Ligand binder design. Structure first.
Ligand SMILES: COc1cc2nccc(Oc3ccc(NC(=O)c4c(C)n(C)n(-c5ccccc5)c4=O)cc3F)c2cc1OC
Length: 280
């Protein structure tokens, strides 16, 4: 991969400079990988500040970026994300623009990986409170994103990260069994469609990572929803939380709760529960 960085626009390169990091602070370990490939080609990295203080990070290689249009899109994506600062939204540590090799994305290392795999792992013992807690953290990261007027487009348990402190980090912003009714038939995406996906995400949490709609095909989902059928209440899901889920799957997007309202409602439910193995 050889990208001509001189073909990039002067004004956009200037705008991206505050997001750029390079070999004077970042060591990429190209011989050691992270994960199975859902998040792409990801390597271990180490970022150092001016005094030599080391930070563990994940370095993603954008191997499909070939032309200057794609690099330009990538830059702006980096600009947008670098502004974001919330405990429940994954940080962008920086990006690398290189003359040789694919563009790179630098994120803080997430010890416990993604949320779906954490909750499916039978050696972990989250309580009902723990799972509600994880859902509450997702809602707050989504509340911040919605306040910044950003549409996620791919919200699901698999796309939320878990750090060493068990802080949930919403990620992969910027999957038909997760899509709102209106997204499936009009291809439109809004904060309200993110709300539907959050409902499915909550359902995944209470089932500890069960696959949604196991007995309906991906092409039969639209009609299933139009017949007024919904995901069944999980064994460990309390009735008030199941109500929240059903409200998230309202056929009319505008009647769905906002993330502000969801944080409020889930916060109330969460406090009624006792017993937690993973404290954030
Ligand atoms: C221990 O196991 C793991 C630890 C892990 N630790 C950290 C990160 C991990 O994975 C990733 C998670 C998220 C992303 N990226 C995003 O969320 C991105 C967003 C929102 N934007 C906007 N961009 C973007 C796109 C263009 C330009 C600028 C940023 C992104 O790259 C990348 C990853 F590699 C891990 C995966 C692990 O196992 C799989």
């Amino acid at each position: 991969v050889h990208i001509d960085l001189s073909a990039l626009n002067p004004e956009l390169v200037q705008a991206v400079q505050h997001v750029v990091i390079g070999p004077s602070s970042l060591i990429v370990h190209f011989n050691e990988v992270i994960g199975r490939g859902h998040f792409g080609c990801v390597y271990h990295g180490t970022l150092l500040d001016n005094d030599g203080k080391k930070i563990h990070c994940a370095v993603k290689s954008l191997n499909r970026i070939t032309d200057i249009g794609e690099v330009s899109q990538f830059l702006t994506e980096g600009i947008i994300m670098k502004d974001f600062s919330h405990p429940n939204v994954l940080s962008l540590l920086g990006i690398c623009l290189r003359s040789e090799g694919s563009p790179l994305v630098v994120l803080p290392y997430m010890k416990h990986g993604d949320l779906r795999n954490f909750i499916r792992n039978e050696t972990h013992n989250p309580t009902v409170k723990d799972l509600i807690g994880f859902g509450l953290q997702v809602a707050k990261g989504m509340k911040y994103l919605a306040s910044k007027k950003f549409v996620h487009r791919d919200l699901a348990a698999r796309n939320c990260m878990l750090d060493e402190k068990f802080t949930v980090k919403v990620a992969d912003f910027g999957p038909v069994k997760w899509m709102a009714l209106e997204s499936l038939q009009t291809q439109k995406f809004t904060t309200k469609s993110d709300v539907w996906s959050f409902g499915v995400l909550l359902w995944e949490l209470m089932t500890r990572g069960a696959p949604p709609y196991p007995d309906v095909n991906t092409f039969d989902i639209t009609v299933y929803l139009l017949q007024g059928r919904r995901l069944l209440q999980p064994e460990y899901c309390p009735d008030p939380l199941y109500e929240v889920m059903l409200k998230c799957w309202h056929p009319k997007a505008e009647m769905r709760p906002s993330f502000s309202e969801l944080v409020s409602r889930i916060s109330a439910i969460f406090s009624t529960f006792i017993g937690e193995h993973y404290v954030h």
